[PDB]
Amino acid sequence: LYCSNGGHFLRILPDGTVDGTRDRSDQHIQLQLSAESVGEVYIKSTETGQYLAMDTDGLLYGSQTPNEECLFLERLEENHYNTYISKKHAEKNWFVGLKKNGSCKRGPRTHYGQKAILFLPLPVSSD
Numbered sequence: 001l002y003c004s005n006g007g008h009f010l011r012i013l014p015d016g017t018v019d020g021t022r023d024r025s026d027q028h029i030q031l032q033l034s035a036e037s038v039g040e041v042y043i044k045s046t047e048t049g050q051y052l053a054m055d056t057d058g059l060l061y062g063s064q065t066p067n068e069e070c071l072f073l074e075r076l077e078e079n080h081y082n083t084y085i086s087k088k089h090a091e092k093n094w095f096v097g098l099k100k101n102g103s104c105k106r107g108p109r110t111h112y113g114q115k116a117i118l119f120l121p122l123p124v125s126s127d
Contacts, residue, residue: 001031002126004081004118006100010043012050012062022102030062039074041084042066054086054094058107072096081118
C-alpha cells in the first residue's frame with residue numbers, strides 16, 4: 001500500500017511480526033480498517049485476521065484482540081494521507097508507520113513529520 005514513504009503493507013507475518021513488504025507474501029498483509037466510531041480505526045487483516053496494534057516499547061504488533069492499542073485515530077492530513085494515533089499512546093502521539101526498507105514496527109519515531117505515517121487506504125489512484 002502507498003504511503004508518502006516506502007510503500008508496503010502493515011503485514012503481520014505468521015512468524016509473529018509486523019513488517020512491510022518488498023516481497024508481498026500475498027496473505028499475511030495486515031491492512032484493512034474497521035472503524036468503531038468517528039475517527040477511530042481498527043486495522044484488521046482479512047487473511048491473517050490479526051489486528052494492527054501498538055505497544056509501549058515503541059513497535060507495532062498483530063494482536064488477536066482489538067484494544068485501544070489497535071484503535072487508530074483518523075488524523076488524515078485531509079488529502080488521503082491517513083495518519084493514525086494509537087489510542088492508548090495518545091500521551092506519546094504514536095502513529096502507525098512504515099519502515100523505509102521492508103519493516104513496519106514503530107512507535108516513538110513515527111510522528112507528524114515522518115513520511116512513514118502518511119498512508120493511502122482511500123478512493124485515490126495512488127492507493
